[PDB]
């Protein structure tokens, strides 16, 4: 009986142009 | 003008709440926004609460929340007013009710307003 907080983690993305 | 409607939960009573914490976090941000280092100018805060208790106390001290206005439980002389708000000389009214009045139907509803008014206060 307890509430959570989110912490993200990115991910990688590249892109060309 | 930023109005915080129910403001009676508003992100807490501070230092309270056992399924929730994020009043430790929350709080504070709102508290030094207002009458903080640098103050805001032109902008009021209105907020509207069901459990005055139940907001924190270092919001509701002068400087934040600086005027504070209490509405009663409407009286007699007040119901009358209320009454009088909805009961307009515009709703379609009985002819059998305008007999005893001679079709003055201002008269009639305010002596219908006063015995509404004497039925629910008795």
């Known amino acids: 009986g307890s509430m959570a907080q989110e912490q993200t983690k990115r991910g990688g993305g590249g892109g060309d142009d | 003008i930023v109005f915080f409607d129910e403001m009676d939960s508003?992100?807490?009573?501070?230092?309270?709440?056992?399924?929730?914490?994020?009043?430790?976090?929350?709080?504070p941000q709102?508290?030094?926004?207002?009458?903080?280092?640098?103050?805001?100018?032109?902008?009021?805060?209105?907020?509207a609460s069901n459990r005055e208790d139940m907001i924190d106390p270092?919001?509701?001290?002068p400087g934040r929340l600086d005027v504070k206005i209490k509405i009663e439980r409407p009286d007699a002389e007040a119901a009358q007013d209320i009454y009088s708000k909805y009961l307009t000389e515009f709703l379609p009214v009985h002819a059998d009710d305008l007999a005893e009045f001679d079709?003055?139907?201002?008269?009639?509803?305010?002596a219908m307003i006063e015995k509404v008014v004497d039925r629910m206060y008795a």
């Open chain 2, 103 to 110: 079709g003055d139907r201002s008269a009639c509803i305010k």
């Open chain 2, 10 to 27: 508003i992100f807490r009573t501070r230092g309270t709440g056992v399924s929730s914490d994020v009043e430790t976090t929350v709080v």
């Open chain 2, 30 to 47: 709102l508290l030094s926004e207002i009458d903080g280092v640098e103050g805001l100018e032109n902008v009021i805060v209105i907020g």
């Open chain 2, 58 to 61: 270092a919001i509701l001290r």
